[PDB]
Amino acid sequence: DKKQALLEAATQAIAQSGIAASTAVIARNAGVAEGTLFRYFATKDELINTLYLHLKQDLCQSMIMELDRSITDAKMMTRFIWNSYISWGLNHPARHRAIRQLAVSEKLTKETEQRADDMFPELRDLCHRSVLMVFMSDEYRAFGDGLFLALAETTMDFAARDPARAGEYIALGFEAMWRALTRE
Amino acid sequence: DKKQALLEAATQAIAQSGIAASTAVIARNAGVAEGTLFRYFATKDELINTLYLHLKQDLCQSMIMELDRSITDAKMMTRFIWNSYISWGLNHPARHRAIRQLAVSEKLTKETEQRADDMFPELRDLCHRSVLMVFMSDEYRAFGDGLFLALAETTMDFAARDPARAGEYIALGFEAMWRALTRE
Ligand SMILES: CN(C)c1ccc(C(=C2C=CC(=[N+](C)C)C=C2)c2ccc(N(C)C)cc2)cc1
Ligand SMILES: [Cl-]
């Protein structure tokens, strides 16, 4: 049970302070000693990796549960995926702030990145058919993920702060994202 | 005149802890004592608007430098405007994070928004000529500026961390921004 309390606490501290969040802070917010956090996670980088995989699985499980297989137009399908991404972030603001900082941290291992793609393999396929070539490359995929997350978090933030127009920010955000990242 | 130090400390502190104003810390790093402060500034709101108008001034003054005369193309001018925003942001990380924070407080007056937009009349006019009209409406103006800034900040993060490819990130980021926000 302590491992979960550690993830939860790290989720919260990283959302507010990014990866520079203190391990001593995370341990006590979880109700455990820092020395115990390091028995679960030998390094802070190992914590970073496990937390990313944990938040990732949760996000993908939530999107898969809303995935309508009847939708057959690519843009509509990506639109409903986006809505589902935004809705998860709106229901879990800290988990999304944390996942975004983790996702762009350069501390994720190759096994983590590799293991990350295989939770929703078809969503992954869908990208290689829509996304701009440059944003699929080894050099710039990470940047393309960063650009997508910045668009998403900004859409989440305006929807949260002015809910009367949530559905308008989310649709405008999607359209902006679609033009930014996808092929002609 | 010592008021310039309260603005320098406010930029940092704000850039370090959001619009939360440890006026104690402010005053201390600024030299001056506590109450010593609404003494230069009235309300915390006015300080925000003041600082904001102060940071925007610094940002415009840094660009007006890079500005040209011969360049005609609407896309080429926006490109220079974007290059300048990234340069200012990379050279002044505190200021840039201060200013994004101030713009999401909704505490800016329409006088401030007016005083800002008056600072660079060509920019105003360039947006009124290139940006999707939806993003120029009263309802969605701030959203469209939030998307631009999110894309610019992410471009900055990837540039700072990988200086070898910075020029490529800036270029990729511009083009994603331009498709996201300007006339089809
Ligand atoms: C002086 N210089 C280099 C500048 C000056 C201003 C900008 C722009 C800007 C910066 C900060 C803002 N806030 C603090 C709220 C709002 C807008 C901007 C410009 C164009 C644009 N579009 C083409 C969509 C969007 C934003 C960019 C470069
Ligand atoms: Cl405490």
Side-chain angles (χ1 to χ4, degrees), chain A:
Chain A
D1 200 75
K2 283 166 182 65
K3 197 194 191 60
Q4 180 57 48
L6 255 20
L7 295 171
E8 178 53 27
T11 292
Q12 304 300 321
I14 295 174
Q16 90 153 75
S17 307
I19 53 169
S22 161
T23 180
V25 170
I26 292 167
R28 73 188 290 275
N29 283 0
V32 308
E34 198 199 21
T36 314
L37 177 163
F38 287 120
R39 291 203 55 38
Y40 285 90
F41 309 96
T43 55
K44 182 168 181 183
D45 290 348
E46 193 171 303
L47 175 56
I48 299 295
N49 276 283
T50 305
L51 180 63
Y52 178 71
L53 254 53
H54 177 263
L55 297 170
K56 182 80 202 71
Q57 186 61 267
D58 192 63
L59 165 61
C60 274
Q61 183 179 59
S62 166
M63 293 187 299
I64 294 177
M65 283 180 85
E66 291 162 40
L67 180 61
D68 191 337
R69 287 160 172 279
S70 74
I71 306 305
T72 63
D73 165 71
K75 182 176 180 171
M76 189 66 74
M77 172 84 282
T78 307
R79 185 168 173 83
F80 295 167
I81 295 299
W82 163 268
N83 289 173
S84 201
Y85 187 78
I86 299 306
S87 174
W88 180 82
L90 247 15
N91 284 155
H92 302 297
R95 295 187 202 166
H96 191 267
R97 283 185 196 81
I99 215 165
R100 179 190 185 180
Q101 284 177 293
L102 264 1
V104 305
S105 73
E106 293 196 286
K107 287 182 179 307
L108 270 33
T109 66
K110 287 164 184 70
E111 23 290 301
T112 297
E113 295 173 321
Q114 196 70 288
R115 197 179 294 161
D117 296 308
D118 317 334
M119 310 172 133
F120 192 168
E122 301 163 319
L123 183 58
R124 166 204 60 183
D125 296 336
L126 177 162
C127 303
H128 300 215
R129 297 195 301 263
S130 300
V131 179
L132 247 42
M133 186 165 78
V134 64
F135 287 128
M136 298 270 81
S137 55
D138 303 349
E139 302 178 291
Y140 304 104
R141 201 182 200 301
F143 182 55
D145 281 349
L147 295 188
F148 178 90
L149 291 171
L151 261 15
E153 219 177 19
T154 304
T155 291
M156 289 172 202
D157 289 350
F158 272 75
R161 280 170 37 223
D162 176 46
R165 295 191 187 287
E168 308 127 90
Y169 295 120
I170 296 169
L172 251 18
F174 168 66
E175 282 146 41
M177 180 277 300
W178 181 260
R179 286 187 298 274
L181 298 325
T182 63
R183 64 184 50 185
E184 178 42 3

Side-chain angles (χ1 to χ4, degrees), chain B residues 162-176:
Chain B
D162 191 2
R165 296 172 196 62
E168 217 36 73
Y169 286 131
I170 293 173
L172 245 24
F174 172 74
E175 198 58 49

Side-chain angles (χ1 to χ4, degrees), chain B residues 70-85:
Chain B
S70 62
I71 281 74
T72 181
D73 196 67
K75 194 175 178 180
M76 296 191 224
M77 295 178 58
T78 302
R79 182 185 288 282
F80 303 156
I81 280 170
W82 168 267
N83 294 170
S84 308
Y85 187 76

